[PDB]
Enzyme design. Structure first.
Site, PDB file in Angstrom:
ATOM      1  N   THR A   1      12.219   1.514  -5.317  1.00 50.29           N
ATOM      2  CA  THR A   1      12.951   0.414  -4.682  1.00 50.29           C
ATOM      3  C   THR A   1      13.660  -0.432  -5.726  1.00 50.29           C
ATOM      4  OG1 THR A   1      10.857  -0.773  -4.658  1.00 50.29           O
ATOM      5  CG2 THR A   1      11.644   0.154  -2.535  1.00 50.29           C
TER       6      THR A   1
ATOM      7  N   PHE B   1      13.360  -7.181   2.232  1.00 47.55           N
ATOM      8  CA  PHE B   1      11.922  -7.224   1.906  1.00 47.55           C
ATOM      9  C   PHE B   1      11.007  -7.270   3.137  1.00 47.55           C
ATOM     10  CE2 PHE B   1      14.095  -8.910  -1.898  1.00 47.55           C
ATOM     11  CZ  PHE B   1      13.620  -7.991  -2.828  1.00 47.55           C
TER      12      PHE B   1
ATOM     13  N   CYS C   1       7.298  -7.681   1.796  1.00 44.52           N
ATOM     14  CA  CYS C   1       7.037  -7.183   0.451  1.00 44.52           C
ATOM     15  C   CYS C   1       6.279  -8.236  -0.334  1.00 44.52           C
ATOM     16  CB  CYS C   1       8.356  -6.875  -0.285  1.00 44.52           C
ATOM     17  SG  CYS C   1       8.099  -6.145  -1.935  1.00 44.52           S
TER      18      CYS C   1
HETATM   19  C1  HEM Z   1      13.943  -4.212  -4.764  1.00 39.65           C
HETATM   20  C2  HEM Z   1      12.646  -3.941  -4.724  1.00 39.65           C
HETATM   21  C3  HEM Z   1      11.823  -3.825  -3.490  1.00 39.65           C
HETATM   22  C4  HEM Z   1      12.169  -3.708  -2.160  1.00 39.65           C
HETATM   23  C5  HEM Z   1      13.563  -3.585  -1.590  1.00 39.65           C
HETATM   24  C6  HEM Z   1      10.957  -3.698  -1.394  1.00 39.65           C
HETATM   25  C7  HEM Z   1      10.894  -3.600   0.014  1.00 39.65           C
HETATM   26  C8  HEM Z   1       9.737  -3.658   0.775  1.00 39.65           C
HETATM   27  C9  HEM Z   1       9.692  -3.611   2.188  1.00 39.65           C
HETATM   28  C10 HEM Z   1      10.899  -3.494   3.096  1.00 39.65           C
HETATM   29  C11 HEM Z   1       8.386  -3.705   2.576  1.00 39.65           C
HETATM   30  C12 HEM Z   1       7.866  -3.707   4.004  1.00 39.65           C
HETATM   31  C13 HEM Z   1       7.565  -2.277   4.472  1.00 39.65           C
HETATM   32  C14 HEM Z   1       7.209  -2.159   5.937  1.00 39.65           C
HETATM   33  O1  HEM Z   1       7.311  -3.141   6.723  1.00 39.65           O
HETATM   34  O2  HEM Z   1       6.775  -1.056   6.364  1.00 39.65           O
HETATM   35  C15 HEM Z   1       7.623  -3.821   1.391  1.00 39.65           C
HETATM   36  C16 HEM Z   1       6.253  -3.913   1.368  1.00 39.65           C
HETATM   37  C17 HEM Z   1       5.562  -3.926   0.161  1.00 39.65           C
HETATM   38  N1  HEM Z   1       6.073  -3.940  -1.098  1.00 39.65           N
HETATM   39 FE1  HEM Z   1       7.919  -3.900  -1.632  1.00 39.65          FE
HETATM   40  N2  HEM Z   1       9.924  -3.829  -2.230  1.00 39.65           N
HETATM   41  C18 HEM Z   1      10.344  -3.906  -3.500  1.00 39.65           C
HETATM   42  C19 HEM Z   1       9.588  -4.025  -4.671  1.00 39.65           C
HETATM   43  C20 HEM Z   1       8.193  -4.027  -4.730  1.00 39.65           C
HETATM   44  C21 HEM Z   1       7.415  -4.152  -5.898  1.00 39.65           C
HETATM   45  C22 HEM Z   1       7.959  -4.277  -7.299  1.00 39.65           C
HETATM   46  C23 HEM Z   1       6.075  -4.091  -5.510  1.00 39.65           C
HETATM   47  C24 HEM Z   1       4.842  -4.219  -6.338  1.00 39.65           C
HETATM   48  C25 HEM Z   1       4.792  -4.594  -7.613  1.00 39.65           C
HETATM   49  C26 HEM Z   1       6.074  -3.958  -4.086  1.00 39.65           C
HETATM   50  C27 HEM Z   1       4.953  -3.914  -3.300  1.00 39.65           C
HETATM   51  C28 HEM Z   1       4.989  -3.923  -1.914  1.00 39.65           C
HETATM   52  C29 HEM Z   1       3.728  -3.931  -1.148  1.00 39.65           C
HETATM   53  C30 HEM Z   1       2.306  -3.937  -1.668  1.00 39.65           C
HETATM   54  C31 HEM Z   1       4.087  -3.932   0.149  1.00 39.65           C
HETATM   55  C32 HEM Z   1       3.141  -3.947   1.340  1.00 39.65           C
HETATM   56  C33 HEM Z   1       2.906  -5.403   1.765  1.00 39.65           C
HETATM   57  C34 HEM Z   1       1.899  -5.505   2.894  1.00 39.65           C
HETATM   58  O3  HEM Z   1       2.019  -4.788   3.907  1.00 39.65           O
HETATM   59  O4  HEM Z   1       0.946  -6.321   2.841  1.00 39.65           O
HETATM   60  N3  HEM Z   1       7.370  -3.926  -3.654  1.00 39.65           N
HETATM   61  N4  HEM Z   1       8.461  -3.779   0.294  1.00 39.65           N
END
Ligand code: HEM
Ligand code: HEM
Lengths: 451, 452
Positions: free
Chosen positions: B265, B390, B397
């Site tokens: 991502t 996000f 996220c």
């Molecule tokens: C540009 C960078 C990123 C984008 C566009 C992004 C996007 C997203 C999105 C859309 C979700 C929700 C997914 C869903 O609803 O099914 C999500 C969840 C998550 N992201 Fe990211 N993310 C990014 C970077 C990161 C980074 C760097 C990490 C960790 C260091 C991370 C960790 C997570 C985690 C752990 C979740 C799950 C949250 C939960 O359900 O409690 N993400 N992300």
């Protein structure tokens, strides 16, 4: 004249069909003494081991450098570069007079920043290892020496610390060297089983030539000046003849610096680290000096010159395992060696440097001990007793470069890390055209001093 | 009654999605059918939402909760009950969420900044050391950076990706596991003998990931050392209710999760931003001017990164056009009517088509295909639920602040140190996996020769 066992038409050649011929020749010198004849089909040499005889052999009025069969095979890709030229070839003297000022102790000031650049990359690599990892010492030293000679030689980055597989140039060069060495022990070289070898050898030559020729043509078209040997060769005129080196010879010198400098210097660093690991008292003293002298985030040129004990450690490593362990001479005219052995014009001598360096009449009885204090007063060492860089006008033009590189890097290694031999490694000295401790591995524990 | 594209007997709408770029195909269907359409395949059904109008209702957490897509279900085989692949109701979801939130705040980024700088410097030095003819493989290098950054900040482990051609074995196994999970989505007859080797490899890769991460956790616990990393926070953090930390197995699953969720991502984002800057010289000039004015020291400070406002806007505009996690899925918690028109039953699925949301002309104006970061100049003027790269609510996220701090830092440094040119006249090719990226995007850099 003493001589080892002959095997019919093969003569003494079967005694050198072994992975470690220099080591076998040292054992023969132990048995037969300061001089012995060695015959192969269609050639003869005499191996010298005593300072007594070697000082005569180093008389340039009586003896000149001979191109060994090894050097003749290396000439297929090193051409008439300095190391593989006869002293009487016009390009030897011309290149020698042009290049000598670019290799002086003074000239190292101009190379120092590029040497630091690669040395910092090596240190950072080791700082970044995880607790579970180890260092392959000769492999990393060779990445360092190759990259350093690339950068100082023609401002080219092989980027060895960014790769698992080396730059294609390096792969071809190493494989070309390996083939030239293999030819020495190859009885039926025109047998069809060697067609692929010949094909590969030609491919590798073309890879080396194409890259180096391209860099020379690029440099000439751009007009840019750099702090490198290439700039000096493009601009330099030979004082005697008034002529500059031609483009082809310049290519050969570049290939030559890489071949002549990379493994010898890598070997030295590796042997020095090995010996420091075996001699804790010596290690403590070297590391104390590094800490006291190297007070800045990166070493200055002047600070490297002040690493006196580190210098002594490196000389003692070259005493025991001089990494280019032999050079060959021929009699210029009929002459008598040592008042005992008549030689004819053209007769060959071979200097067995590791055996010279163990002459008890010069060094005392403790010749197998690693004691850098032997070099504390270098004016007390007799003339022609210590020859890891060969002799006279045909001595290593890269001596100052090598020692500046090795002192810098060893100092930095000692300043930044403690080293542990996690394997209880047994010294295994691999012989190619040079010597190195094969399989030598260590773990480093950082002292956490920033760069 | 809900729009739906043409159905073809038993195959339903599936013959219309015969592609490895389904999000891009679905955007074209949204162009034809509008803000909502049903899509049926054999044996499944969801409703794709494209308007801010409807998406704001879908983002009502009292009415809808996160659904695990089939992709997420396959990823769960090696991400377990980590945050991204847990149902909101699973005890480890809420427990991990409450423990980890403070380690991901804007404030916590001060503690990760030095490690992010360490990897960013390695990237810049790599590019400075290229010879003149060489070029840069942008997404490949961005992924080396993001992986190493999450490794170092996450569990103080150095993958050393800039020292290698072939990645660290962990990375090779993780990438191959992800690839297999994606391939299962398009696999009829998954129990056919032709997939025995796949299954064997998948199990080997799971073991490689588990053994490394479990070892690092056990090493850390035996040494007692404290670090500036997520692993230290998870070992020490206790759930208020139970008084317990996360167990060692779940900690491992979070570590694997951070790597999976964060690496591509963020790498995609950086790659898209660089691509768009190359296509928009005016925008490039302004971004590079700010980088030069702000980044006055040999390495960036945390406070300086916060002052890279236009760089921030560039990144948000790249996320507008190509949000690198392009979809999230929801289910109806109870029977409810969406948009006053469409009745839904408990359990019905919705899918948010984020790139299409981000092109809603009623929100953004008619120029939705243009790259204009100035759109984000006054972020309080953007309507609620219009911009969702996000995700949403409590299941948004957790890594948002981390990602943006990383990307801003790195893009600022890239602009400070180099001019970039597209030596190939590259045509944008957006590869779809779990994420989006510009596949094959390559450039040459011309150094500005500013030391570090
Ligand atoms: C540009 C960078 C990123 C984008 C566009 C992004 C996007 C997203 C999105 C859309 C979700 C929700 C997914 C869903 O609803 O099914 C999500 C969840 C998550 N992201 Fe990211 N993310 C990014 C970077 C990161 C980074 C760097 C990490 C960790 C260091 C991370 C960790 C997570 C985690 C752990 C979740 C799950 C949250 C939960 O359900 O409690 N993400 N992300
Ligand atoms: C510890 C490191 C080194 C050792 C032990 C070493 C040893 C030697 C020896 C023994 C010779 C003479 C060979 C003979 O008589 O046939 C020689 C020649 C030579 N070395 Fe080195 N060398 C080292 C490093 C280097 C480096 C770093 C360079 C270049 C950058 C270099 C360039 C040369 C050249 C060009 C010659 C041929 C000089 C001439 O005949 O005009 N050497 N070296």
């Amino acid at each position: 004249m003493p001589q080892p066992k002959t095997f019919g038409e093969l003569k003494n050649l079967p005694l050198l069909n072994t992975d470690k011929p220099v080591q076998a020749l040292m054992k023969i010198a132990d048995e037969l003494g300061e001089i012995f004849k060695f015959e192969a089909p269609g050639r003869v040499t005499r191996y010298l081991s005593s300072q007594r005889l070697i000082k005569e052999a180093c008389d340039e009025s009586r003896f000149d450098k001979n191109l060994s069969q090894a050097l003749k095979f290396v000439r297929d890709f090193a051409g008439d570069g300095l190391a593989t030229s006869w002293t009487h070839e016009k390009n030897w003297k011309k290149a020698h007079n042009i290049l000598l000022p670019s290799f002086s102790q003074q000239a190292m000031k101009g190379y120092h920043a590029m040497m630091v650049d690669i040395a910092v990359q090596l240190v950072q690599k080791w700082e970044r290892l995880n607790a579970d990892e180890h260092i392959e010492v000769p492999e990393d030293m060779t990445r360092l020496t190759l990259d350093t000679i690339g950068l100082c030689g023609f401002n080219y980055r092989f980027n060895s610390f960014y790769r698992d597989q080396p730059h294609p140039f390096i792969t071809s060069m190493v494989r070309a060297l390996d083939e030239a060495m293999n030819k020495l022990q190859r009885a039926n070289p025109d047998d069809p089983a060697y067609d692929e070898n010949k094909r590969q050898f030609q491919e590798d030559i073309k890879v080396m030539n194409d890259l180096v020729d391209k860099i020379i043509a690029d440099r000439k078209a751009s007009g840019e000046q750099s702090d490198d040997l290439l700039t000096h060769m493009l601009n330099g005129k030979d004082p005697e003849t008034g002529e500059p080196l031609d483009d082809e010879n310049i290519r050969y010198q570049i290939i030559t610096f890489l071949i002549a400098g990379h493994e010898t210097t890598s070997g030295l660093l590796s042997f020095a680290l090995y010996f420091l690991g075996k001699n804790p008292h010596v290690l403590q003293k070297a590391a104390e000096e590094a800490a006291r002298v190297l007070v800045d985030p990166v070493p200055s040129y002047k600070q490297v010159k002040q690493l006196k004990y580190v210098g002594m450690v490196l000389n003692e490593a070259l005493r025991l395992w001089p990494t280019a362990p032999a050079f060959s001479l021929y009699a210029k005219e009929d002459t008598v060696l040592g008042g005992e052995y008549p030689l004819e014009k053209g007769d060959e001598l071979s200097v067995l440097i590791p055996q010279l360096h163990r002459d008890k009449t010069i060094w005392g009885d403790d010749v197998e001990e690693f004691r850098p204090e032997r070099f504390e007063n270098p004016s007390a060492i007799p003339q022609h007793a210590f020859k890891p860089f060969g002799n006279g006008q045909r001595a290593c033009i890269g001596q100052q470069f090598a020692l500046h590189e090795a002192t810098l890097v060893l100092g930095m290694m000692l300043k930044h890390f403690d080293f542990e031999d996690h394997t209880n490694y047994e010294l295994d000295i691999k012989e190619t055209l040079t010597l190195k401790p094969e399989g030598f591995v260590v773990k480093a524990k950082s002292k956490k001093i920033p760069l």
